[PDB]
Design an enzyme around this catalytic site. Structure first.
Site: not given
Ligand SMILES: [Cl-]
Ligand SMILES: [Cl-]
Ligand SMILES: [Cl-]
Ligand SMILES: [Cl-]
Ligand SMILES: [Cl-]
Ligand SMILES: [Cl-]
Ligand SMILES: [Cl-]
Ligand code: NA
Length: 129
Positions: A35, A46, A48, A50, A52, A59, A101
């Site tokens: 990562e 990203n 979109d 967003s 990280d 995120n 989650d």
């Protein structure tokens, strides 16, 4: 800060990640390598809008507030900048919420594609833990 492999294994062990929800320490080290290359200051934008953040690339769409991800949530209740600290406590505490989650470590695309079903014990071999 750029961590050593064993240094990061030790830090994660102290923060209770070894076998957290059944994921052995090598899983967490493997995910961090791919990562962030073990760099707490890593950021990636990203498509979109967003971002990280940090050693586990958490995120801003769901988990932290960066003030520029419209209609996002802040489920770990932290500023995304907290995730870039040399102190990994905020990243580890937030990761524990993410992995709880429902999708486990599959939340981390690099874990699913590069660590899952590999010998992850290799990542902590030779470390004093
Ligand atoms: Cl390495
Ligand atoms: Cl392991
Ligand atoms: Cl925002
Ligand atoms: Cl929220
Ligand atoms: Cl906040
Ligand atoms: Cl730390
Ligand atoms: Cl699971
Ligand atoms: Na957010």
């Amino acid at each position: 800060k750029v961590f050593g492999r064993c240094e990061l294994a030790a830090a994660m062990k102290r923060h209770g990640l070894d076998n957290y929800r059944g994921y052995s320490l090598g899983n967490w080290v493997c995910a961090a390598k791919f990562e962030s290359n073990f760099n707490t200051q890593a950021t990636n934008r990203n498509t979109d809008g967003s971002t990280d953040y940090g050693i586990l690339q958490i995120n801003s769409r769901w988990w932290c507030n960066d003030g520029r991800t419209p209609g996002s949530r802040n489920l770990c209740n932290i500023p995304c900048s907290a995730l870039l600290s040399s102190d990994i406590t905020a990243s580890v505490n937030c990761a524990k919420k993410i992995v709880s989650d429902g999708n486990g470590m599959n939340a981390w695309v690099a874990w699913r594609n590069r660590c899952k079903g590999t010998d992850v014990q290799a990542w902590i071999r030779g470390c004093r833990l």
